[PDB]
Amino acid sequence: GHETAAQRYSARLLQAGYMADYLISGGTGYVPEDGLTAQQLFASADGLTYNDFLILPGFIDFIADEVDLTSALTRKITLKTPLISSPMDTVTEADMAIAMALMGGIGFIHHNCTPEFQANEVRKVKKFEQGFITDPVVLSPSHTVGDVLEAKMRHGFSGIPITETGTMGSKLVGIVTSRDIDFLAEKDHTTLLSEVMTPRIELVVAPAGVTLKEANEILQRSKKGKLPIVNDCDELVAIIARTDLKKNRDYPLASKDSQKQLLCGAAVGTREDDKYRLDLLTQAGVDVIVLDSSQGNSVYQIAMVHYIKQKYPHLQVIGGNVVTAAQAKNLIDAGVDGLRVGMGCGSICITQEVMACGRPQGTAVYKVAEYARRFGVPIIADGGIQTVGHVVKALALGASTVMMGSLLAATTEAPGEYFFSDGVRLKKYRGMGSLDAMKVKIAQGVSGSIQDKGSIQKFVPYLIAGIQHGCQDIGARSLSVLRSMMYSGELKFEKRTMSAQIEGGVHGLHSYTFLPFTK
Amino acid sequence: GHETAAQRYSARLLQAGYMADYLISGGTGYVPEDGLTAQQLFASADGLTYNDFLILPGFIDFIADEVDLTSALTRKITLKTPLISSPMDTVTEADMAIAMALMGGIGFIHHNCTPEFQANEVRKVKKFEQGFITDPVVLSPSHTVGDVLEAKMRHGFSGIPITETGTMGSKLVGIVTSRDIDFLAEKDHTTLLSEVMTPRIELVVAPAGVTLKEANEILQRSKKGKLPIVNDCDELVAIIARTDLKKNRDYPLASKDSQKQLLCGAAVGTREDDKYRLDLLTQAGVDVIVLDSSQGNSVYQIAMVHYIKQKYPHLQVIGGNVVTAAQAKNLIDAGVDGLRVGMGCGSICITQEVMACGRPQGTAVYKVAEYARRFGVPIIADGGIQTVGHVVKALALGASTVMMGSLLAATTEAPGEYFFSDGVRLKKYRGMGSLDAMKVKIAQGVSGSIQDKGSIQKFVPYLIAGIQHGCQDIGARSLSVLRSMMYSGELKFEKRTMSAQIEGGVHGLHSYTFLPFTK
Amino acid sequence: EYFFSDGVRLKKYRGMGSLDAMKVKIAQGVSGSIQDKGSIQKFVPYLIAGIQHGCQDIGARSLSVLRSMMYSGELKFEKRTMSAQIEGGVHGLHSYTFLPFTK
């Protein structure tokens, strides 16, 4: 368990020169009671959203950089950062899902596409960083230089081992890389690969059955770009690439499986066709599934959870969108590994004014997360996240991870093109029930647009630093400590009137121009 | 009664594989308590309007299309859809009242007109769709072709049976339709109808005393447009027309009486003059009456209710406007068959800031409907209905039907013309106390304008799909089940702070553009 | 389809070089939108009546006569300064609401 502000302060006093006190209480020192407990804040029976309250500051005895952001995504998946990219077609295809997994979050690929398109986008995420490359691009020596350029333009891989048959089930005869085809003139689609490959007698190779680390040290000291791995009869078993050692050095938080591939999630619906779609995604090596619906407490979703759990029992499933403990119960009881929380919040949404249904998102995160922790189930807080203060509030109220749409929209890794709407660079961002993309067919989203924010790799470390500094002013040394302080009543809250929200912002300045972060 | 979310979920589990539980309670399974009951929401003693609360989502085990929207309008009238057009001069003359009754609602014709104009607009509604046409347009053969074109331009009917004397009580001698006068040149007002009519020896006719379904089958297999009905002495009793079989096929929800005529309501005031008006409206065949006043709990209105009930005892009467149970009591006790609820809500209204009187419309619907169900009396929620979410909320709080002004204004079927005011197409919409149309003479309305929305026949199925999808996310199979869940405490509500209303809308998008429905 | 963008009914209208619907590929159109105008069968007779009344006020019995007066020098023109374009519009009214045509 955590240690109290009184215990920490008392310990820092015991580290310096500055009796019967331990006998009166002991460890439980006096702190004057101020603000509300989360139990008391929500006992009010009014719909509170992230703007309607504040967190009171604590006691600081660590630097903001020591703050641990490690988070459970599901019963069995842990991420080094609380951040998830929302499965929408204007937010997350493979470029976004790679960028989010590299910065220590995850992406879920959207399903407003064909089953084969979605499984191919998952396959692009899983192939980006590698331990042993077990299914490399291999060519036969009767091929041309034109084939090596076409392979580079079709996959993107310039380093191609050459085996006799042209598959892994064969003897290695050489390697072709970019540096031995790059200078060739346009007399390409004539020249055979035996004329250009570095031949197998010149190669540094390692014997099959080496661990990934032994093989790393062989490749590392060899100064080569690739290391082929070969069996006792001299056949090609795998390759490894120094690029992945560079990627590893460059991204110390990256969310990876045991094969050193990035983690990827995907969405599916609750139709019969989603059963086939799920089979392609599991063949593509997907790590976790979202069941992606406005109202997840349905007989159709509970059927699809039981189907996934009976067919792919090692696969992780997140139950859909819920806002009440009564909804969360039937999906936790159906056997989900996590839940998505939010309905009608979300910047592009109109569900509340179309359907009458929804809930205020601070209340929904608190009520669903307080119910879900009784069973050990993690919560994703989804939509309404406009600031790093909303992320810190969502995490403080009991969410394990936060899922963002509009905050990640109009980054360089978000799908589509910029188009410069109205004297601003301004990219498109639509919602999935938007009727802009897909019997009267009612809309539930609004087909809007968002300002440019540059790369995820520059914007997510701003989120991480904001969350860590928020935890430091609270006095929480990790996100697990922050939630422990909240359920214990140590974390205190204050409500805001309207004027309190106004004085928290920027007042009667004439001009106003904040710079978010400077590096 | 109705079956609960716990009972339904348990039943859907018993349809598959996935004990003391029945002995501990049985049927009343555990659901965690979350949100407020309607009785607890309104116990707050604060004026809540449709924007200040949300409905929490339930359990789904049916498709949204199964949702039954059948509603009581009065103690004795039932409509296949909850929707009513408000009796205002910029909303509802006969074109609107026909369009609303065809889509399974009703219209009440406005009274900012003469008694003879209002009775003629009712008569136009009652004539649009027909079983037996019992007093058809008839001519003598001694009329001219010019008289048939004049009849077509004065009534709108082309199929004119010809009887000797020229009335529906004389020997049939032929029929004239459009196809036997349409090609005639401008030598019209000379030629006798005997020269053009299909003669009685050529006609398909049916014997008087057939049922409507027997006559339908005879007309149907004949492939003619009309079927005359004739008695033993071969005089014209009635006609039927295949055009009405097409109307019946084309509009499966249409609100019809036993004679297969559309239902129509009308407004009258509480002055002594309104008795003559009421005589003419009942002559025209009107089905139901509104008594149309800002404050219905008056001695004048209670007089007029007693007069209508003593004179036309089969006629249905709706009480004025009320917002308190103390008002509702004296009108229910005077013997009304329904109540109109709302005062100072309504988009064009200023009565609250002029008179100091009114009530917040969510509270008023709840308090009046909760009092009125004790006596079996239906409620109309009137005014403030800006969205399909407001309709679902009004119905959930206990209204049986919803009456709309500004939402139906600036459709094609609403009275007046468009006039393109300020770069927007903008039809007129005014309120009935506008002083634009009806001592110092104080105004209570504001003479504004509303954007074009096309046909009622395209816009009402959008309302219907929105209400059905709203019921589906709530988990209600019908509007009766929705109100039963509300009075039982199964239906749960949350209040909204102002920031909760903000996050329910559209956030910091730059551009924003929602298509409401796609077909 | 109409899509109701900002409290106005709002059908789409683009230009054929708009890069919205078709090497740097330079764009030459802008992909805007236009307010609802109803049917061609109701709007074209307003155009026809406006053209006929314009010809009548000019004194021309047909469009061939109108062009014949122009090439002959019988048809006369006046230039407009900017203030002349302003007085040809609607002036210092507070509210303004023209009905185009009414059958």
Ligand SMILES: NC(=O)c1ccc[n+]([C@@H]2O[C@H](COP(=O)([O-])OP(=O)(O)OC[C@H]3O[C@@H](n4cnc5c(N)ncnc54)[C@H](O)[C@@H]3O)[C@@H](O)[C@H]2O)c1
């Ligand atoms: N979280 C939100 O607040 C929210 C709100 C609206 C839409 N969305 C998103 O929009 C997208 C579309 O999903 P959706 O929300 O329209 O719900 P959905 O696509 O799951 O279901 C749409 C409709 O079909 C029904 N349905 C689903 N599976 C069915 C089955 N097997 N048989 C019969 N009927 C079935 C549902 O009950 C509902 O009426 C998703 O990305 C979703 O997450 C999200």
Ligand SMILES: NC(=O)c1ccc[n+]([C@@H]2O[C@H](COP(=O)([O-])OP(=O)(O)OC[C@H]3O[C@@H](n4cnc5c(N)ncnc54)[C@H](O)[C@@H]3O)[C@@H](O)[C@H]2O)c1
């Ligand atoms: N519901 C609302 O919030 C609201 C508010 C204002 C107006 N309106 C509408 O505008 C219109 C006018 O409303 P109104 O209340 O002015 O109509 P009204 O005719 O009831 O009011 C007429 C005035 O004279 C009185 N009066 C009515 N009958 C009388 C009689 N027999 N003898 C003597 N005095 C009599 C009334 O008490 C009132 O002061 C109606 O269409 C009504 O629905 C609605």
Ligand SMILES: Nc1nc2c(ncn2[C@@H]2O[C@H](COP(=O)(O)OP(=O)(O)OP(=O)(O)O)[C@@H](O)[C@H]2O)c(=O)[nH]1
């Ligand atoms: N070839 C290869 N080796 C890797 C990769 N990622 C990690 N390794 C190696 O596996 C061992 C793992 O050590 P770390 O990299 O510190 O830990 P990690 O958890 O695997 O990855 P990070 O979370 O990125 O630090 C080291 O020997 C690494 O060189 C990769 O993508 N490819």
Ligand SMILES: Nc1nc2c(ncn2[C@@H]2O[C@H](COP(=O)(O)OP(=O)(O)OP(=O)(O)O)[C@@H](O)[C@H]2O)c(=O)[nH]1
């Ligand atoms: N060569 C190769 N790399 C693969 C393959 N599958 C995945 N990769 C990854 O792609 C990267 C290697 O790309 P290469 O084309 O070989 O070139 P590189 O060595 O990265 O050199 P640069 O691209 O110039 O930096 C590594 O991160 C590999 O893990 C494959 O079949 N062949």
Ligand SMILES: Nc1nc2c(ncn2[C@@H]2O[C@H](COP(=O)(O)OP(=O)(O)OP(=O)(O)O)[C@@H](O)[C@H]2O)c(=O)[nH]1
């Ligand atoms: N002909 C006729 N129709 C009547 C009369 N009263 C009501 N109607 C209705 O008026 C409508 C028009 O009738 P007609 O003019 O005969 O033409 P129609 O048979 O509907 O066929 P259309 O020419 O396609 O409109 C029908 O829907 C009838 O139900 C009446 O006296 N004569």
Ligand SMILES: Nc1nc2c(ncn2[C@@H]2O[C@H](COP(=O)(O)OP(=O)(O)OP(=O)(O)O)[C@@H](O)[C@H]2O)c(=O)[nH]1
């Ligand atoms: N002539 C005529 N027959 C009708 C009309 N409406 C229904 N019918 C007939 O009445 C009988 C009952 O049909 P239903 O399917 O029950 O029609 P309905 O419920 O009365 O009316 P809808 O709600 O319009 O379907 C059939 O013989 C119909 O053809 C009508 O307006 N005119």
Ligand SMILES: Nc1ncnc2c1ncn2[C@@H]1O[C@H](COP(=O)(O)OP(=O)(O)OP(=O)(O)O)[C@@H](O)[C@H]1O
């Ligand atoms: N394991 C190996 N043993 C021997 N030679 C190798 C081995 N792997 C690659 N080569 C050869 O070494 C040279 C450089 O290969 P490398 O993979 O580093 O090239 P590259 O990735 O195209 O270089 P660059 O990064 O500059 O573009 C090539 O001639 C290539 O065929």
Ligand SMILES: Nc1ncnc2c1ncn2[C@@H]1O[C@H](COP(=O)(O)OP(=O)(O)OP(=O)(O)O)[C@@H](O)[C@H]1O
């Ligand atoms: N019951 C009948 N028996 C015999 N002939 C009939 C009968 N009813 C109509 N006719 C004749 O049949 C012809 C077509 O009549 P119908 O009512 O179908 O025409 P219509 O509705 O005016 O045609 P349209 O829809 O094309 O405008 C006319 O010559 C008409 O006089």
Ligand SMILES: O=c1[nH]cnc2c1ncn2[C@@H]1O[C@H](COP(=O)(O)O)[C@@H](O)[C@H]1O
């Ligand atoms: O069209 C839509 N209507 C309603 N909710 C949507 C729609 N599309 C996505 N959402 C939700 O909006 C969330 C993103 O909200 P945002 O981060 O505030 O922009 C998503 O993760 C979904 O839960």
Ligand SMILES: O=c1[nH]cnc2c1ncn2[C@@H]1O[C@H](COP(=O)(O)O)[C@@H](O)[C@H]1O
């Ligand atoms: O002039 C007026 N003043 C006050 N209330 C009016 C007036 N005319 C109509 N109303 C009310 O306004 C309702 C329509 O409200 P709306 O649907 O919000 O536009 C009507 O059904 C009447 O109850």
